[PDB]
Amino acid sequence: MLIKVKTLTGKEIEIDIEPTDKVERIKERVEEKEGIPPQQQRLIYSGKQMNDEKTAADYKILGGSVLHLVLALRGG
């Protein structure tokens, strides 16, 4: 399951995580191709933000979509 999440400049994030995975580790790879550390990006799933494991099936199991992450600091 490829990821095409936009960013502050409409960039790309490669989560490469299936809908059965948790956003605690799914967002780790998404920001790995972006630059942010995993425990720093408050990823917003077009109306909600991940918390704890946050299994990707909860967010409608969307394929790629446009996840406009929040780049707030001091979240670790």
């Binding site: 917003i44 077009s46 909600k48 933000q49 406009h68 707030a72």
Partner: peptide
């Protein structure tokens, strides 16, 4: 009336 807006405000 928007989860993104309120979470941005909270941050």
């Amino acid at each position: 009336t928007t989860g993104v807006s309120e979470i941005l405000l909270k941050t």
